[PDB]
Design a protein around this ligand. Structure first.
Ligand code: CA
Ligand code: CA
Ligand code: ZN
Ligand code: ZN
Length: 157
């Protein structure tokens, strides 16, 4: 699965109250930019209406047959490129969401989920963003690990 348009829209449908709205918006924007700088994709935010990629914070059963599980465990999930639910990214509202090294950093989690939104599966490289399990990495000048660059380059050339 892969997108056939280069300019994709996204919409943040709701917000965790644990971060300022500005910090939620910056986490999401920066997570998309990680992939944009390694691909031809251009991400465009809309405030209402139907976007290619919906982003939301939900708890437990939330209408897609993949319920969240409360604190810890599954932090978020995302759907492969396609119409409707395709591309969408959901975050477990019951987590602690941070902009620090404390569990769990929203920017890093979003970055992983957006890999799925663009067509990547999990990686077996423990250093890869797309590794199945979360590990905090310094965020200040974070760039995609080389394994993830390889992955998105394989899809979008
Ligand atoms: Ca959870
Ligand atoms: Ca969608
Ligand atoms: Zn979901
Ligand atoms: Zn994943």
């Amino acid at each position: 699965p892969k997108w056939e348009r280069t300019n994709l829209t996204y919409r943040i449908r709701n917000y965790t109250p644990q971060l300022s709205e500005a910090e939620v918006e910056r986490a999401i924007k920066d997570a998309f930019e990680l992939w944009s700088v390694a691909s031809p994709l251009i991400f465009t935010r809309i405030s209402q209406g139907e976007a290619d990629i919906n982003i939301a914070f939900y708890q437990r059963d939330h209408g897609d047959n993949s319920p969240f599980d409360g604190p810890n465990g599954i932090l978020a999930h995302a759907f492969q490129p396609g119409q409707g639910i395709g591309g969408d990214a959901h975050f477990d509202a019951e987590e602690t969401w941070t902009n620090t090294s404390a569990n769990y950093n929203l920017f890093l989690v979003a970055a992983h989920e957006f890999g799925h939104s663009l067509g990547l599966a999990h990686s077996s490289d423990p250093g890869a963003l797309m590794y199945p399990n979360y590990a905090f990495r310094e965020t200040s000048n974070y760039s995609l690990p080389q394994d993830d660059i390889d992955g998105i380059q394989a899809i979008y050339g």
